Amino acid sequence: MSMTDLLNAEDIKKAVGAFSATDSFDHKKFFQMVGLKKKSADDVKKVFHMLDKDKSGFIEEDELGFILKGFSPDARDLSAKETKMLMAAGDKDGDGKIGVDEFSTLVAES
Numbered sequence: 519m520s521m522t523d524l525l526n527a528e529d530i531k532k533a534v535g536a537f538s539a540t541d542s543f544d545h546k547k548f549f550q551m552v553g554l555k556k557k558s559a560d561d562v563k564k565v566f567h568m569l570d571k572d573k574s575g576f577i578e579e580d581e582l583g584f585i586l587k588g589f590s591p592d593a594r595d596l597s598a599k600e601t602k603m604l605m606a607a608g609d610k611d612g613d614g615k616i617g618v619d620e621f622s623t624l625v626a627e628s
């Protein structure tokens with residue numbers, strides 16, 4: 519869609535920097551720095567739809583290793599530790615996959 523128009527490029531610029539590490543994943547802080555939780559639920563839809571590269575409606579480990587490339591360039595490959603923890607923390611639901619409504623509220627739980 520446009521992770522720039524919908525959210526804010528300036529908020530994105532901080533957000534990518536909050537995951538720009540090996541294993542130091544900080545989803546609550548990312549979703550606040552990117553202002554995700556401060557945009558609409560239907561915007562949070564188009565958000566997830568940019569990370570879901572394959573359009574299947576579910577993020578799993580193949581996408582989850584470089585998920586940031588839906589937020590923006592200079593995303594990089596996340597650590598194996600990060601991927602492992604992100605999968606387990608991100609799936610609030612027991613599918614082993616991140617879905618939008620979880621992912622939105624994931625970070626309000628923090």
Ligand SMILES: [Ca+2]
Nearest residue numbers: 572574576577
């Ligand atoms: Ca997918």
Ligand SMILES: [Ca+2]
Nearest residue numbers: 611613615617
């Ligand atoms: Ca789920």
